[PDB]
Amino acid sequence: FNILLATDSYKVTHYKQYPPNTSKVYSYFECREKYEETVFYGLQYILNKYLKGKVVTKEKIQEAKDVYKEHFQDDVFNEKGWNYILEKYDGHLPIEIKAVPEGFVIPRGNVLFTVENTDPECYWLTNWIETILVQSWYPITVATNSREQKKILAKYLLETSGNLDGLEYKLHDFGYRGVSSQETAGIGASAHLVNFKGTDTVAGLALIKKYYGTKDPVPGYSVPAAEHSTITAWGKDHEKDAFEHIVTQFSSVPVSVVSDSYDIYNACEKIWGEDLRHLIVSRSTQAPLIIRPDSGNPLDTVLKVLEILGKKFPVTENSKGYKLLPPYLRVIQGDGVDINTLQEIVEGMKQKMWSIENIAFGSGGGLLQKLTRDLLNCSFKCSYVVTNGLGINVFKDPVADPNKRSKKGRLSLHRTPAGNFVTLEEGKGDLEEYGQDLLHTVFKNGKVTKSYSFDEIRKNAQLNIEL
Amino acid sequence: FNILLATDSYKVTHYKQYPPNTSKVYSYFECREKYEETVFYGLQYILNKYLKGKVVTKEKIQEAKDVYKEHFQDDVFNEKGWNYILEKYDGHLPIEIKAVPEGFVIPRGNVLFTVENTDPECYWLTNWIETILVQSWYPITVATNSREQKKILAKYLLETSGNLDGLEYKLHDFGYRGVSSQETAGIGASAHLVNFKGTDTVAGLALIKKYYGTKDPVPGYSVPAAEHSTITAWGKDHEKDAFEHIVTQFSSVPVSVVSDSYDIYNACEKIWGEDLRHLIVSRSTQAPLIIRPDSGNPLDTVLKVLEILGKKFPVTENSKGYKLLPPYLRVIQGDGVDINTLQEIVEGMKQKMWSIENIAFGSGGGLLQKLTRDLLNCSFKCSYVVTNGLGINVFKDPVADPNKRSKKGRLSLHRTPAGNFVTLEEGKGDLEEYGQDLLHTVFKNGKVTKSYSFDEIRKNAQLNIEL
Ligand SMILES: CSc1ccc(CNC(=O)[C@H]2CCCN(c3ncnc4nn(-c5ccc(C)cc5)cc34)C2)cc1
Ligand SMILES: CSc1ccc(CNC(=O)[C@H]2CCCN(c3ncnc4nn(-c5ccc(C)cc5)cc34)C2)cc1
Ligand SMILES: NC(=O)c1cccnc1
Ligand SMILES: NC(=O)c1cccnc1
Ligand SMILES: [Cl-]
Ligand SMILES: [Cl-]
Ligand SMILES: [Cl-]
């Protein structure tokens, strides 16, 4: 990896565009003003993997110089300025980054981190690294969207069952194949694990161990489960034999069995319902069969599967008046799930008097891929510069869009007297009217100065209903 | 990178699930049946970076064993199967992959690649690597959606100007900050460069040189350009000074200057139009000023910018009857651009008699992030197995969704008598009624066996209008 080749191409040219005698460029990131509050997560990964230590070498400078000469068909690369960092700082970036603690849940429109150069010669460096830092939008957005789904699950589980038992296993990550790269898979899976413990995206485990850390051996867990190949390989007329083999191989742990290869309704009513019923009603409460539909309208299919199972298996009514399958039998809907369809399904279940205890959800592309930087309006902008020794507040205020207006001056984040948050502009945090700045230095002059464990991040990101 | 920890968690338990004495599992990838045709691109990256050579070691087996013991809370990992590959094949995968040539443009619902194990003990390995291989959906989808935008641009450039000059520079990649990882940025940028030569996502250059290669030193190009920080740092009252400094700095090369920091209309009509007009009109055809709006309704902003500039600069009428700014002045719309708004903008310009020669487009999130595996229904499924020495044709036919039905048996890709594509099922390619199979072996037993340069991929992906 070469940080000199890790920026948008136009930035290579920006050192020539800043006002002359500029000794400092100070910029900030926010999720501009439902997604009212966002989980701040993922900067520590970027700091450690890409920004810390000796990130400039003579070879990296020469390689960048050669690439940019061809890419621009002109010599515009700031070799002198990069060689300065190499010679003066042993290739360590003279940048200070201050950030809200990871896991913190912050309302939209607040400063989440700031970046500035610590050596006047490196005024151009602050926004060189915008591109790599702005990619924090992704773990922020996955963690936030996963937490909003946890909010919906908690509200329906509490109403239907009177408690939150099992909440942290109700949204399982199925997204490994549906994201755009191996690296995205690990980042996204780790962001989902801020909120839940169920994942099949194995890449998230190694990322959390390497850059965050947990007291437990692993941060996420899974169970044996079939796919269409392991059912259909038996031949169409032998679906029952496949189901029998698989539940017998995994008789003492939970096992998920995709049941829609040919006819989900026939499989639940006849194969599970009658032919293999003796192998289901014998199972432990710690080792249920989890029937998995995987096609059709997600709501209609869940409701019809539950209706079928409720007629073939003993059903109890819990203390809130909702129907509950026996403890050896559960359902997972892992097709077509995103935050909108998750809400539709749990509301449809509630209307038909089915407890949310009966169901869990798997989500793949909806959880990790169908998200953009535009969802929370993640943005990085310069708000303060020093030119000719005088600080000036800088901002953008497009006439066409008031929403794109940026903040002015030196920023700080504070608790309000009512316990909310406020971002103070124009250096007003220096007046000390609002208690301590919540931004902490996390990176300075090539060194990670403050780190958080994954357990702390999870604590910071808890729901109020959990609290 | 560990291939043992690079699959969905449920796949680890699969070896147990298949029918006893299964010696072969054969699977295939398609973009299931506007996006009628898809560009096949990106498999060669995956084969080289992740699948070739010695990918199993004793340390990787031990690492996977220890992770999965905690992740499943049980010892379900197939240590013996992985050890077999390490001992018998020096850790090279006994898999054969056949694929259509990269850059080929293939209608939906055709086999694009197939995967099978070459050793009977490794029947479980075919679908182990599903997760890694299915991530090819992303470069396929970026390349396809980029090509569909090229078709729109070509249609409207041809109609408004009579030729396709400049087509390959008309959609520029702005997506580096808006994708979910560094790895995704390189993959996606490379897939856009199958169809265009303009890009700010520098990561794509290194990936193309390393895994595909080009005759030219670099596959893509850029120009100097401003961002809001380099304008707003001068202070709001000094926008004109920033513009004058930047244009002067890059007088002999094309320069893009974002002009919407405060008032885009005021900047075009008063600052560019009157105050700095002398600086603009003196510029060469090879180095025009490119005015860049970045906010408001994209079609409304483009039309109003062009009306303003048409009244301050000398407009001509080209041979098709469309208006043309002088050659030293162009526009780039780099906000809100996606396949749908691109179409809206070029059609609105045509209706207002504005030649598409006047404009280019910058796309970030829409080009590389706002895409999912569901757009082209990219899907990997087992179609053939051998059990007890007998081949059987296998598939999934969900009752609720006919679209999810998968193909049966051994597959092959052919040309029809009219020159179209057909996928033959059930081994029927062997009858030779449709000539030789189109697919080529690209991977066998740990080695890449056939490969394509980026120049060949570009040629294969050309538009008919270009041919
Ligand atoms: C469908 S609901 C269910 C399922 C399994 C069980 C069997 N173990 C249990 O009960 C204990 C053990 C740990 C998980 N515990 C859960 N408690 C509520 N809900 C859960 N879902 N879940 C899940 C979700 C997705 C996947 C792929 C696998 C598992 C785990 C859930 C509590 C009970 C209820
Ligand atoms: C807005 S139109 C324009 C722009 C610049 C020029 C100045 N050089 C040129 O003309 C020669 C030089 C190479 C590219 N050539 C192009 N030929 C048609 N169209 C193009 N667009 N384009 C672009 C796309 C994205 C970015 C960030 C910068 C530039 C390059 C375009 C031909 C002329 C017309
Ligand atoms: N475990 C599962 O059922 C699963 C995992 C990944 C993708 N789809 C399904
Ligand atoms: N070159 C540009 O104008 C650019 C690049 C990346 C993102 N936005 C704008
Ligand atoms: Cl060095
Ligand atoms: Cl599956
Ligand atoms: Cl910009």
Curated annotation (Swiss-Prot), chains A, B:
GO terms for molecular function: cytokine activity; identical protein binding; nicotinamide phosphoribosyltransferase activity. SUPFAM superfamilies: Nicotinate/Quinolinate PRTase C-terminal domain-like (SSF51690). Expressed in large amounts in bone marrow, liver tissue, and muscle. Also present in heart, placenta, lung, and kidney tissues. Keywords: Acetylation, Biological rhythms, Cytokine, Cytoplasm, Glycosyltransferase, Nucleus, Phosphoprotein, Pyridine nucleotide biosynthesis, Secreted, Transferase. Beta-nicotinamide D-ribonucleotide binds at D200, R292, P293, D294, G334, D335, G365, R373. Changing D200 to N/S: No effect on activity towards nicotinamide. Alters specificity, so that the enzyme acquires activity towards nicotinic acid. GO terms for cellular component: cell junction; cytosol; extracellular exosome; nuclear speck. Diphosphate binds at R177, H228, R292. The modification Phosphotyrosine is found at Y169. GO terms for biological process: cell-cell signaling; circadian regulation of gene expression; inflammatory response; NAD biosynthetic process; positive regulation of canonical NF-kappaB signal transduction; positive regulation of cell population proliferation; positive regulation of ERK1 and ERK2 cascade; positive regulation of gene expression. It catalyses: beta-nicotinamide D-ribonucleotide + diphosphate = 5-phospho-alpha-D-ribose 1-diphosphate + nicotinamide + H(+). Inhibited by FK866. FK866 competes for the same binding site as nicotinamide, but due to its very low dissociation rate, it is essentially an irreversible inhibitor. It is an enzyme of class 2 (transferase). InterPro entries: Aldolase_TIM, DUF5598, N/Namide_PRibTrfase, Nicotinamide_PRibTrfase, Nicotinate_pribotase-like_C. It is found in: Nucleus; Cytoplasm; Secreted. It comes from the Eukaryota. Homodimer. Catalyzes the condensation of nicotinamide with 5-phosphoribosyl-1-pyrophosphate to yield nicotinamide mononucleotide, an intermediate in the biosynthesis of NAD. It is the rate limiting component in the mammalian NAD biosynthesis pathway. The secreted form behaves both as a cytokine with immunomodulating properties and an adipokine with anti-diabetic properties, it has no enzymatic activity, partly because of lack of activation by ATP, which has a low level in extracellular space and plasma. Plays a role in the modulation of circadian clock function. This is Nicotinamide phosphoribosyltransferase.
